[PDB]
């Protein structure tokens, strides 16, 4: 309690303070309102990818023992991708077993941007989309762009 | 007060504003400096989509805050 959540709150504050002093190009993020444990963030469709032009919204939920356990990050915007599902769950190592205190929310959003550029079709949350990525990359890129025009612009 | 606007290229724009200025007013200032039409601009502040008709104060944007600018296509 007290001490655990003070350390987390000190750390969340430090990450927020760093975002304000040195705003990053790949995302923007901050508290929804009063509660420092609940943020929202945006990601820009990376320029080279089929998601270009789109703005994708996520929620970020810090646990009480942050940063020793990872935040919970989920898309709220619909996105066509093998490693992200209907509910906006994201298959990414560093959000589970590979989590380290050295990572920040900003670095995680960066890695998620890498996931949009270079999907991982061998660990698929959505097998259907994964099979399309594997056996017809042109169809995949078309549908990705279609969903980006439909939901993220 | 001053606020900053980050763009997709990495460039930062600097704007002189008041807390009562509407998002429209800020889009107008951006047009002046960069020539991007307001109807093409999407502004974001710390994860939140900024809409027309609301003030900087309504979104708790403060001295030296930094918004992000995206374009519609």
From Swiss-Prot, chain A:
<dbReference type="GO" id="GO:0005737">
    <property type="term" value="C:cytoplasm"/>
</dbReference>
<dbReference type="Pfam" id="PF00179">
    <property type="entry name" value="UQ_con"/>
</dbReference>
<dbReference type="GO" id="GO:0032991">
    <property type="term" value="C:protein-containing complex"/>
</dbReference>
<keyword id="KW-0833">Ubl conjugation pathway</keyword>
<dbReference type="GO" id="GO:1904262">
    <property type="term" value="P:negative regulation of TORC1 signaling"/>
</dbReference>
<comment type="function">
    <text>Accepts ubiquitin from the E1 complex and catalyzes its covalent attachment to other proteins. In vitro catalyzes 'Lys-48'-linked polyubiquitination. Mediates the selective degradation of short-lived and abnormal proteins. Functions in the E6/E6-AP-induced ubiquitination of p53/TP53. Mediates ubiquitination of PEX5 and auto-ubiquitination of STUB1, TRAF6 and TRIM63/MURF1. Ubiquitinates STUB1-associated HSP90AB1 in vitro. Lacks inherent specificity for any particular lysine residue of ubiquitin. Essential for viral activation of IRF3. Mediates polyubiquitination of CYP3A4.</text>
</comment>
<keyword id="KW-0067">ATP-binding</keyword>
<dbReference type="GO" id="GO:0004842">
    <property type="term" value="F:ubiquitin-protein transferase activity"/>
</dbReference>
<dbReference type="GO" id="GO:1902916">
    <property type="term" value="P:positive regulation of protein polyubiquitination"/>
</dbReference>
<dbReference type="GO" id="GO:0070936">
    <property type="term" value="P:protein K48-linked ubiquitination"/>
</dbReference>
<feature type="active site" description="Glycyl thioester intermediate">
    <location>
        <position position="91"/>
    </location>
</feature>
<comment type="similarity">
    <text>Belongs to the ubiquitin-conjugating enzyme family.</text>
</comment>
<dbReference type="GO" id="GO:0000122">
    <property type="term" value="P:negative regulation of transcription by RNA polymerase II"/>
</dbReference>
<dbReference type="GO" id="GO:0043161">
    <property type="term" value="P:proteasome-mediated ubiquitin-dependent protein catabolic process"/>
</dbReference>
<keyword id="KW-0808">Transferase</keyword>
<dbReference type="GO" id="GO:0061630">
    <property type="term" value="F:ubiquitin protein ligase activity"/>
</dbReference>
<dbReference type="GO" id="GO:0005829">
    <property type="term" value="C:cytosol"/>
</dbReference>
<dbReference type="GO" id="GO:0005654">
    <property type="term" value="C:nucleoplasm"/>
</dbReference>
<dbReference type="GO" id="GO:0006511">
    <property type="term" value="P:ubiquitin-dependent protein catabolic process"/>
</dbReference>
<comment type="subunit">
    <text>Component of a E3 ubiquitin ligase complex containing UBE2D1, SIAH1, CACYBP/SIP, SKP1, APC and TBL1X. Interacts with RNF11.</text>
</comment>
<keyword id="KW-0963">Cytoplasm</keyword>
<dbReference type="InterPro" id="IPR016135">
    <property type="entry name" value="UBQ-conjugating_enzyme/RWD"/>
</dbReference>
Curated annotation (Swiss-Prot), chain B:
<feature type="cross-link" description="Glycyl lysine isopeptide (Lys-Gly) (interchain with G-Cter in ubiquitin)">
    <location>
        <position position="27"/>
    </location>
</feature>
<feature type="cross-link" description="Glycyl lysine isopeptide (Lys-Gly) (interchain with G-Cter in ubiquitin)">
    <location>
        <position position="11"/>
    </location>
</feature>
<feature type="modified residue" description="(Microbial infection) ADP-ribosylthreonine">
    <location>
        <position position="66"/>
    </location>
</feature>
<feature type="cross-link" description="Glycyl lysine isopeptide (Lys-Gly) (interchain with G-Cter in ubiquitin)">
    <location>
        <position position="63"/>
    </location>
</feature>
<feature type="modified residue" description="Phosphoserine; by PINK1">
    <location>
        <position position="65"/>
    </location>
</feature>
<feature type="site" description="Interacts with activating enzyme">
    <location>
        <position position="72"/>
    </location>
</feature>
<feature type="domain" description="Ubiquitin-like 1">
    <location>
        <begin position="1"/>
        <end position="73"/>
    </location>
</feature>
<feature type="cross-link" description="Glycyl lysine isopeptide (Lys-Gly) (interchain with G-Cter in ubiquitin)">
    <location>
        <position position="33"/>
    </location>
</feature>
<protein>
    <recommendedName>
        <fullName>Ubiquitin</fullName>
    </recommendedName>
</protein>
<comment type="function">
    <text>Exists either covalently attached to another protein, or free (unanchored). When covalently bound, it is conjugated to target proteins via an isopeptide bond either as a monomer (monoubiquitin), a polymer linked via different Lys residues of the ubiquitin (polyubiquitin chains) or a linear polymer linked via the initiator Met of the ubiquitin (linear polyubiquitin chains).</text>
</comment>
<feature type="cross-link" description="Glycyl lysine isopeptide (Lys-Gly) (interchain with G-Cter in ubiquitin)">
    <location>
        <position position="6"/>
    </location>
</feature>
<feature type="site" description="Interacts with activating enzyme">
    <location>
        <position position="54"/>
    </location>
</feature>
<feature type="cross-link" description="Glycyl lysine isopeptide (Lys-Gly) (interchain with G-Cter in ubiquitin)">
    <location>
        <position position="48"/>
    </location>
</feature>
<feature type="site" description="Essential for function">
    <location>
        <position position="68"/>
    </location>
</feature>
<feature type="cross-link" description="Glycyl lysine isopeptide (Lys-Gly) (interchain with G-Cter in ubiquitin)">
    <location>
        <position position="29"/>
    </location>
</feature>
């Amino acid at each position: 309690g007290s001490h655990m959540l003070e350390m987390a709150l000190k750390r969340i504050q430090k990450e927020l303070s760093d975002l304000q002093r040195d705003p990053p190009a790949h995302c923007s993020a901050g508290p929804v309102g009063d509660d420092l444990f609940h943020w929202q963030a945006t990601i820009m469709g990376p320029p080279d990818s089929a998601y270009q032009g789109g703005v994708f919204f996520l929620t970020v939920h810090f646990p009480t023992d942050y940063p020793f356990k990872p935040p919970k990050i989920a898309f709220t915007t619909k996105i066509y991708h093998p490693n992200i599902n209907s509910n906006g769950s994201i298959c990414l190592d560093i959000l589970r077993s590979q989590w380290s205190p050295a990572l920040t929310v900003s670095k995680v959003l960066l890695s998620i941007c890498s996931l949009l550029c270079d999907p991982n079709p061998d660990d698929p949350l959505v097998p259907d989309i994964a099979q399309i990525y594997k056996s017809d990359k042109e169809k995949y890129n078309r549908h990705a762009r279609e969903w980006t025009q439909k939901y993220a612009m | 007060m001053q606020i900053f606007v980050k763009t997709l290229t990495g460039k930062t724009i600097t704007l002189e504003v008041e807390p009562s200025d509407t998002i429209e007013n800020v889009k107008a200032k951006i047009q002046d400096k960069e020539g991007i039409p307001p109807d093409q601009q999407r502004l974001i502040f710390a994860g939140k989509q900024l809409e027309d008709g609301r003030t900087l104060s309504d979104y708790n944007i403060q001295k030296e805050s930094t918004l992000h600018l995206v374009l519609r296509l």
